[PDB]
Structure 1
């Protein structure tokens, strides 16, 4: 992970979810895609 800003879809299994006030990437193709902010 990199913390970043602005969220994009890295793979077809990034679900992309708004958890509290921060958009989280949770993925089920690779754990690699888990960007903390969008």
Structure 2
């Protein structure tokens, strides 16, 4: 995954979830869209 300080929805299947106080982008379509730490 991509640890960035701007996490965004790159696709329409991407989805912002906060787990353990960490903003994350969980996608189902493309696993390259998986992101962390916004």
Normalising by the smaller structure, the TM-score range is: 0.7 to 0.9
Higher strand share: 2
- Whole-angstrom distance in 1 between the partners of 2:6 and 2:14: 14
Structure 1: runs of 5+ lacking an equivalent: none
TM-score (norm: length of structure 1): 0.79
Count, aligned residues? 38
Structure 2: runs of 5+ lacking an equivalent: none
- CA RMSD after TM alignment: 1.0
Moved beyond 3 Å, runs of 4+: none
